[model samples]
Target: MDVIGERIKRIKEEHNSTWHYDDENPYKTWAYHGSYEVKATGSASSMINGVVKLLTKPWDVVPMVTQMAMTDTTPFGQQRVFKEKVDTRTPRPLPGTRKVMEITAEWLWRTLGRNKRPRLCTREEFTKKVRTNADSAKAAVEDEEFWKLVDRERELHKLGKCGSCVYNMMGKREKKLGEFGKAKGSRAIWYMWLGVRYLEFEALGFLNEDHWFSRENSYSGVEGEGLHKLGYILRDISKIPGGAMYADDTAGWDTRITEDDLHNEEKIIQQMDPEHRQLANAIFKLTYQNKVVKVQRPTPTGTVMDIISRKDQRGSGQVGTYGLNTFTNMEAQLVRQMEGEGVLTKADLENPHLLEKKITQWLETKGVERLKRMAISGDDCVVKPIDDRFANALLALNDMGKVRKDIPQWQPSKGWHDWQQVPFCSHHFHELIMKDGRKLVVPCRPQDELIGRARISQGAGWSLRETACLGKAYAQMWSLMYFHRRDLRLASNAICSAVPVHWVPTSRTTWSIHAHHQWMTTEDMLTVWNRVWIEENPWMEDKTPVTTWENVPYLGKREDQWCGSLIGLTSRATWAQNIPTAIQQVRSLIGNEEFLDYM
Candidate 1:
């Protein structure tokens, strides 16, 4: 025997049987029992005994058989048995092997009686009869069975009784007439087969053929095939039910129809409905962003032109280059300074010419000397630039302020420290001196004069319309929480000059109605306002229109009541009158007459 076989024989011979509990409680303790003995005269037996001794103590020998039997019954042991008994066999068949084998058709016929099984036809038989001969097998089966089955379809076609002959001829003629070369040549003959099967099935009383009958079918006998082939045709088509069968000439006959093709066909059928057709056309155009001139009809040049035109329109010429604008020396210097001091560099400052034009214009318009004086005088400066020029100058001044601190202030302390050791009074005096003398005080920490202006702007001269519009626009653009009317106004005045329409109140009762209306009604004013809003709030889309009703509520009960109740009370009363419960309750409590009067 081989090493493995010898080891296996030894293991079987030396097996033991017993039950030995290792701990005090026999039931709770780990235990083992069972054993077998081997004759110990030979050298092999002695070696096996030595291996056994090395593996287990003399005391554990009593439990070894029980542990082996218990553990060896596991799945891993079963797998090992399988590997030894079956997987490890030599290549030669065993002497008396009796495994049965047969062809699929024979097996199937035996498994399922001849009556329940369909006859199998060889590929040669199918091709010779169906493709060449014209023999009819009508007398061999019941009319229904004959019609429903495809086993003898080739025979029927060979007999010239096939209903699809005319269809085949017609298809050929149509192909030739249409001058479809490759596509026509690729035409399948299965459709004719389907038509013939459908006709036979209908004749057998298995189906109502009226639906398939058409003028073409009356003349050519080809229109009988609908969406599906005859029921009998596919009955035994697959070896397994619903399994696929292929024809020599056709590939993948069981492919499922797709929704896109169905939709296209439906669309073609609905061409008579002008509205639907127009809607479809419009939707198609919209899909291409109107870059297709003729959607339904093919227009090659028109499509190309449309695409090219749109490209030209949306391309560099129209929308401008995405390249950064070249910056002026002064603007670049200011940006470097601001960036160095941790202040944000506005995009406008990156373009030199734009920065120069903006700052020069702002200085000319707003009195550059006064601005400088305010900065030199250490006045509070929280001014928002209403125009590009003002914004540029303020931004430059802000950068200057950031870097011009008189003395270094201590970094903010977090926890209690040696207060006695630190010069707190000196710091306070330093701040005071700097505030009183510094050329520029940052807007966030404005000096006295800017602080005064900020307060004044809050009080009167600030345009409420601009403030509300800008603030609302900012909130919407940034997806921030909605700001109340006054809050929006203050925010815009403090931050930017243009507020979003969605944030402003436009209806009769809201405070922003007049402003909203005024802003909207002004010719080309929306564009200007939108531009400003976009400039200040870069998050907003330029093309989307801002509407007051969309952005803000128009009316309040108090305002409506004050406005002859047209704004508030009348509307509320109208709404209440429409309510079934309120109406019923009022009628029951006050009588119909009073209820009518109140309504």
Candidate 2:
């Protein structure tokens, strides 16, 4: 008996939606929206000074300054003091909210301690040392005593015994990490801190557009655009060939910074100071959150892009590079090897998909028989390495017919026959990125196809924005449920079905998120699936035609009511006639290339 498994299943069975609201089981306390006392008032000059202080002062100062500044109407623009009822009820923390916060704190300490040499600031050194001190602090404090002291502080604050209920007046002392920009040597750390806090606050349902510290409210468009300009400048500077090493600013160099030169990677790199030249390279080289990014350096592809763009501008386009060229050495050798391995049959040479369909169908029956034979026959019947490689190569072919072992057939006793085909396509992947810096390569489709296949519609009842928002909302919903009910490792696997379906114009894949890994060929893709194929099944009997008792219509309702063919689909002369016709159409369009690049 799997007691633990059953126990988990029982717990899962009882699980319900976490979005319920009960007056008795209120999620939030009155302290959630409670106002804090602040002396500082808002002003234009004070706001500018506050920005400077915000960037330069300790992080603890943020709450006080933020509270004081936020209380005024000027920073938020015109404000109305409406007493007419609104949903002022705030939400309490989520189930794992506190755990996530604790983990974030630990992560901060870990990131700080990970460095061999601490920063110049005292706060940085203290932060790094806290990794060890935290454990010691926990060990020294008794759980009951700690709770007793916390309760005393809370009671005093509630009674106004400490003067005010404000956080500044009665909050417990915690270690400060210092200024945002100074203590953290890299910008990535600060960004990470913000992201972690965002997740924590978001989970708590405390994030709102009106909230002063919300991403929308806190963000400045001018600074954001400026930072992006700086980012691209650095990227371009890094790409200049040998610019980091060869650049010299001392030799009566004008060090001219012009408008057009600002955009040019080569021009800026050539004239910039040698010390400043490599700064961009160093910044880009450092991975954000241990994730590898492509180094933005010079390459042949970039040269080609530049050449193509230049060619377009000059009205000198790249003519087709095709001609009456024979196969190249490698292509010829590959063709010869393919023909020798019996991968390219006479029918395959004529219709490439025909043999592929035959091979895949043959594997269902003859391949299994061959495997049984090999087990009994010994080493003499073993497949050769070259043949084995060819067999593995064949598994990647898209033309392979549907697996038919499960297909319906005539029963001898009943004398009844029928058939159905279930097609499969495996040429897709999902780049599943999580909030906790995880990247998964799940085999899945975009939201549009998923919805289309599931036959769901975002009708007039739902707006486009709501549909888009629901995509993320459901993703979060499923993720929480999946983690709670399933193993952590299994959650990374593809949970999508593999049937082809209708496309949606509005639907698209999440291409904006960056992927650590990238796309590749069919053969390389099979490696991820841990697939292998062996060509041990060779049916030597004379070929026979397939016969169906009744015509089976293709799936879907449409004007093209075509049925599966019982007779041979194409004649030998049909393709021969079509080939010349196809080439004639191609030639009429444009001049043939000077030489075929593939050849």
Candidate 3:
């Protein structure tokens, strides 16, 4: 169609308001994305954007505020927020700033369906497609030229290769602990990821150094090996009649875990044409500060970079040399979030015990009678926590006891520490067919999830069907959130930032995305219920509430109701869902506005 062809016309119009909660946010998560900050989407770009708009009409631009400046020291780290404005004719991308969006279309379906269900049919596509790879491009890693592009990207973005830290984070998240409040419960579900590592690598091993997605990678690029990226391996819950076993792709690997697995990894590295595979068996070699491995290179040469420090300076222009950036990008960003907001006092940081308490309080929040009171109509704004789920998730993974323990944390009531952990190294690797009819001989990690959880992976072992299930449910839930923003930012900015040209907005400077761990149960989603949208059939509305999607009817199948698939999905364990009086009140107020505001 031409730019304005009748077949594909531009449909621009005004609205009562935007119906999406997420769409209404970015102006809200700060890091480099906040109003006081500047990035591709932050304050400064509006100069480029507003002027672009002025070219067309009076779709005016809101004046911007002077953002705080910051810089990263210790050289080559993911430094943001400089105390002073620095030199930059060229802007760069942030590393450890990316998160993998590896969910596939088919896997997403099964996640909210078969794989997460307590029962299954013998002929269901769930079992058949569990081990498949829907699109190779999405999981691409082995292509040399494509990988070379990744090699450059890491340098451009200040990203590093996969390392030990990335692998650990990946591994820990794999076995999610579904928890709840004083009803007192928590369940550890089967897994993916032993750590989060940089996707670009020193030399590939177990972690898929090859799996580079532009959006992000574990400084180690927490993604595992190509073998693990294939997909899920579904089986019965037991050897006998059962619900089903679930092993994420990256499950059965201990990078250098087993003698046999370690022996096998040596063979994979033997295939890589490294003039030298010095630390080929390791994810990243360790050394004292400033010490250098000085691996000699064959071509495009200088001395090979240091294994620990000065890593970038000496490496030959050739590939396959030393390890990642000496500093960790994720840690740097975490520091930015923490130090920027005084999220924790210096003492909270130095004294792990004190820090844990404050960090815990910083994240977990709840509703009310308490809601109306806690969510003050007008109040003094306080310093905030980083919006991302990473730092909090990391603290949770490393030691839930730290962030949780005495606190009221959620756990899976259905499966709280009741099952055995899967053994590293599965029966054998399996092959999954791809979209273009190609085949991938991938690892088949074994996984079993029962009513209760008891557990505990090595590569950086991870999964697919389950990945899609988590990813899909997240996507659908996000889709159902119905993103639509009615208030223009120009007004919010004028009132909130520079001298007011528009109405004043909230006084909060940072926008955070805080996602607490859900009690991993597959129950129907019970969101902030809205009677208006409920009475007005979805058929009649162009835009409704974000609550509408979260509150959709159950049926893990239909698009509108797939959110209902709860076996392995999540939902709110609200006060209404728990407290006695609140329950009856919610029922009595079902068709009313008050209930909608707090459900």
Candidate 4:
């Protein structure tokens, strides 16, 4: 049998009860009831007929008994209301008592426990209490219990109960019990009874009876009434098997099964067939493959090759990097290994991990160093790795010339240029630079020329600006040139880079230019203005305060010159501190002579 079907059967066996119905004394109150009959009704009859035909025998009553004991239950029901009007001059409506009727199948499972069952709460009661507590807890807002109640109310709402109800009940209960008092003793019982009553009214046709109830007054008769009550009991039991009851003449017992029984049944079902076992294995294997791919794919080719080679020598649990180039090499190596191991085709790669490991080893041996060196080079070219194993396996394709050389090498410089024209170039370059710094200067040619020109212009302009207000014009000329170069690169990079990692015209561009200009201006001003300031304020050396810029005359009237003097003084002091530190930390460690060699 299928596991689901077998599990259902096992549940029935563990929970099913055998009890005789008190048919002779029809009014005798039994704890539970069941109805089992092989009647032609709905899809059940057709299914029974088909089973009988398939088995090539008359339908056995014994099987029906087993089915009833295992699978019978009316787990859900709906109710509808109706009213009757009496014919009178006033057109009076008859005030009639509502009667409930129910329909049910035999139940085969039940549980009995106070703690095991879900705690039921009424919306009307819970809402009032929640509101009261929410108001009271406002003063001591951080009270843990208050928050707990709030969360519980939220949970109830999530479970489809009215949040207002939970709040009201909990709120009221908390108030009645006092701030730190235990909940009322009757809370559980009250909720339990409320739950039973709700189910009875909603599911047993109590509130809306006319549509469901038999109209012939048959329910009034003793036998009919007994049957009606049995239907109600069965319907409720089926809906909640964990709280169902079963009875004989002298004793009643709950037919609920424990968690252990369910677990055991599951274990038994799992051991049934090889197909299920294989399916479980396949699921685990696929999960492992996915993890491997996710971790290894983004890694650099050199790392991937290393990992593969390590796996081959050390066997599994080997760590390594993987990248596009390495992945190709690994794949080719894997195919060859599989062939040597008697796995000659694509079908052999079905064991993905094993195949992947083998391929990794093969690629490791094939020239991982060469691939790594190429990847880090500043050349602009594209290189694709070849899978020799795949190539070898395609004998037919090879014969037809469908297969090309597996590994195609491209010059780094050529590839870089080609990639620059593609939308993904900036991202690709960024990734490459992160892996290797050699490529940083590949796109720096334009910036270098622009910076060289700007330096010369700033040096000459500083002297001219000191003599006259034509300084503003010189500054504007230099600023315009700086921005013009910046804007050109910004536009060009945008056109050449991918959208997500594009290095062109972002907010960073403005900040970068601003910072660069600020640093340059400060450095230049410090050298030129500090000497001019000292010359004008000869008494500054004696620690005597010179008159403020406003009192200083024509030179001070030039705001640019005055501002530059202030800026230059600050910059000089800062440089005095930073230069010594730089020399001590970097220049001394590397040696000033070696630094010159590096430059």
Candidate 5:
């Protein structure tokens, strides 16, 4: 080390204060330097802070801040609201709802404990959990408790008795030595302030918008967007060159807040706020709710909506991500009952379907062999996955010009034959973050896709602003009922068909509601029929048969005849596809850096 030191050094001057070599020294004062004193002596906190600064480099990003504050609303506006100390993340709605219901039941038990008197909250409130088994499951709708509870909840929904419920929850932020943001845990159960509750109206006798009664929650854009900004700054720190040592985690410097230069940075952030900086925007809140949402009358065909909430999903615990409002089992069943007698017939499938003629004419050259392979019976085509051998055979016929490759096949899934062995791209990740604070030496990428995927989501609510959409029930009637439709009136026959259960409402595969789960519906109680929805046997039936043998032509309201392909009477199948590998997309993006691998 001395040999290298002996080499002539090119000493430079900065503010005329830089200490130099013996010959290079302008001021001869026994190597006395106010800055180096902190490094070479004094408390350990001052020492490491001085040392790292002495050796490391620095740069001023003043312009980066200046232009951001002066430019588009998208820039500085985001940072001010994205404060480090403030957090308003509501809980997951589904789990929160489940917890609230369970506690409501428990609260009843406690009230009845000491005095044998049932202290109640409201007339609409349910006092116990569900039990649905009439014969197979425990929570059968037939149970006296189930119906009464449903009725009571519906009444409460009508009265808006269940708004913004809360519960003290386990905080997620971990600190030094296995500590959480809330060490003692919270007490007040918090309900989300901003959840979407549509005033649902029954349609055509079958209405399915259970969330119409205000039991709904959705993701927040204002809160979510701001958090994304804060994440990037820390990320920018983590990804910089030599970012590994960006936060000195050694025993000497780890606890030293002075080394953080917090005085300078925190104040800089404070200055960026709209109130302090006198900026045009630093979005604290944005409210769009109006008292005059709509005026209407109930006629079973129309409903109004309310788009309210500046914040979104506040105090949420048990809500799922926003999704298309659904048609209730009530709505679909009603539609079926009303339309069945009005427009449908048992032999609807037997009517001259468009594709039957095309399929039969196309079949003449190949003879009867191909017919038997694909046909579920004389009336229907293969409504199931053909075995590998038969699939190969079908492909073989097409390759040799024995079958028509130019023809179109209508199944739920587009690609079928080659999927068993092909690879797919994964879209998620399983990250084990070093949440432990003592071991928090490594900088974390908390804002990566995994975190983003969890927090931000989009979907329809119980009511809509512009469209006359029926929440869940409406979503199903349009999407699930028909394969895929964009035309205002695509298929008259299918839309009017009474049996559009999970899809086409075909008899071969029995269907059940997937919206039901562990919180509300147990595994054994998901369906009345004894069966599970799996690829092997989707339906709970012994002998699966095509409900309708003939091709039912899909027509418009005032329907007329059409040309050849437009009236194609081919049978369609629904194939479930599990695309690519899971989380591979995340792994591809994870910790990719110049020195990351070495670290």
Candidate 6:
């Protein structure tokens, strides 16, 4: 025996016993769908009322039977039932003035069983079926051209020939244009020069062989080959002590002073592409004032443009060419004078004790802040003793005597974080295949209590078949908490077979859709659905519109009503099964007086 099924039968018995809970509701969810109300058959006028109405309006009566069937059966002919009884009422689809209905039938199952479900279909068929009002000959041509270009570009890229065709070259030009705008190409060469200087400093034995930027690594042949090397050198030379002193001071790097050095001015200038030489000249002068400097290139012809220097050109570009501007030259000379007084050179860097003592004395004279700045400046190059001593010095100053040393370290908890549980709400219906090759739509009494209890149980919930609803159903159905306004937009889109005029929420779990009654072809429906989904769901990073057909599952936008929450679907179905509660819910939603007029 099915114990849980028997329990559902008992709940039905209780529901019948306590029917008054439904009777208290003043308004009904299903409105009066029939055109005329029929009195009891015993009444004399009842017979004439039915007969005269049917005879006088034969055309209207002809469709009433089919309309009656449509109102009673499932969206897909999965099962059948005699839905019309005494006090027969059904939801009336209104012509205008948008309202939220809380659809009470197989809205979601309709999607699964109707033509909406994923079945075998060709692209040509899909293209022929989908509809759109925005169709234009020009747009169609442009679309074809765009895809053709994309295909060609992708094919060319796969074959290892980039920028080979017009489209590909255009792509290249666009990328290079951005790089040009940012002056990335010019600054790259400037950084290269700085790397050459760092290499010369290392070769001169200022930095040891084990240093990260050591020339022993074959990779160092590429200037700033390692990011660590680039970052260290850039930071070191950018600091005031070195940046200001070495700005225009090519004293040790000129042929007159260091004739045999590989990075000497004559050799450096000769090796570079002359196209970039003018920018390099300006970069050398700006290096004194700033680490990352740019030569103004106002045109693509490689002609250098001079910047109009402000009255206070403090950190601004005022210099050009091989010679520094007057202000920058003055700053460089002052830095040189300071450097000449007590220069810390290669010898001081090699010996740790003397270097530490010298750093301590400097720190005492200039305070810890300045000494700290100088330490970072040299450590960035791995050339100063304070780079090694600073950490110990900091620890000595703080002296946080052994607090965490004795305690055991706390490790993070293993396994995935637990998720908050949400209640399950499933719509109950019977799916039947008849011997006569017809599917029967049957409405089953929902076992809300039993389903809730089953969901709470560990074992029953574990079995997919035993569960109340599937994952897709849970996501698609309308739960009051997770109900979305988009579902209403889709609902009207499907029901009226047209694009919804607006997407507005009526209640937390309900939404309204309004549109014209004019014919909306399948192609038009698909087009609108696709466009709306794209506009609604945007990419996280760039907020770029995402095409649903390309990214989402299925060929195009789904027309069937699988887009709702669980509570909404089940509640609607349950209320359809029990009118009293449905009426109560409707009355509760819109106050009784307003709801009566809403009918």
Q: Estimate each model's TM-score.
A: 0.13, 0.14, 0.19, 0.16, 0.17, 0.14
Tens digit per residue, CA lDDT, model 5, 37-108: 001111111001111111111101223212222321121222222222112222222222222222222322
Prediction 6 global C-alpha lDDT = 0.22
Q: Give residue 403's error in model 2 in angstroms.
A: 46
**Model 4 Cα shift for residue 476 (angstroms):** 15
Give, for candidate 6, the lowest lDDT window spanning 10 residues: 96-105
Give lDDT: candidate 5, residue 131: 30
Selected candidate, larger lDDT, 1 vs 2: 1
**How far in Å is the alpha carbon of 405 misplaced in model 3?**
24
Q: Report the lDDT tens digits of candidate 1 across residue range 1-599.
A: 12123222323343323212222211111111211221111010000111111111211233332232232322233233323431221122111110100111122113222122112223233334344322122222223443344435434433322222211111111211223223441223333334333332322211112211121211111123211111111221112222112111101110111121112212221322443344333222221111111001012211100001110011111100111000011122223223323333445433332333333333245322221111000111111112223222233332222211232322211211221111110110010011123211000111121111112111112244433333233323212111112222222232222222133422121121011222322223335443433333332334344443234222233422332222223443443344344334423432223211211
Best by lDDT: 1
Which window of 10 residues has the lowest lDDT sum in candidate 1? 318-327
Best by TM-score: 3
Clashes of each: 37, 2, 85, 39, 50, 19
lDDT of 2: 0.21
Q: How far in Å is the alpha carbon of 92 misplaced in model 5?
A: 30
Q: Residue 164 of candidate 5: its Cα lDDT?
A: 23
Identify the runs in model 2 with alpha carbons over 4 angstroms from their true place. 1-108, 111-508, 512-517, 520-599
Off by over 4 Å in 1: 1-308, 315-566, 569-571, 581-599
Q: Rank the candidates by TM-score, best first.
A: 3, 5, 4, 2, 6, 1
Better of 1 and 6 by lDDT: 1
Q: Write the per-residue lDDT of candidate 2 for residues 1-599, one digit (tens) a residue.
A: 12122212322233332211122311121111111111121221112221112112222233433443332222112111111111022222222222222222232223222322211122223234334333323321323443344334334323322211111110111122222224332233223222222221222111111121211221111111111122122222233322111110111011111111112211112222443333222211111101111001112222000000000000111010000000011111222224335644434533423434434443333332222211000000111112333323221111111011222321111100110110112112222333333332222222222222112212223443333222322222222211211111111111111100111112212212111111111122213212210011011122222122011111121211122111122432343234333333323332332211100
- How well is each residue in 108-170 modelled by candidate 4, as lDDT tens digits? 001011112212233333344334423322322234443344445344323333221100001
What TM-score does candidate 2 reach?
Answer: 0.14
Q: Scored by CA lDDT, what does every candidate get?
A: 0.23, 0.21, 0.21, 0.22, 0.19, 0.22
Instruction: Give the lDDT of residue 30 in candidate 5.
Output: 15
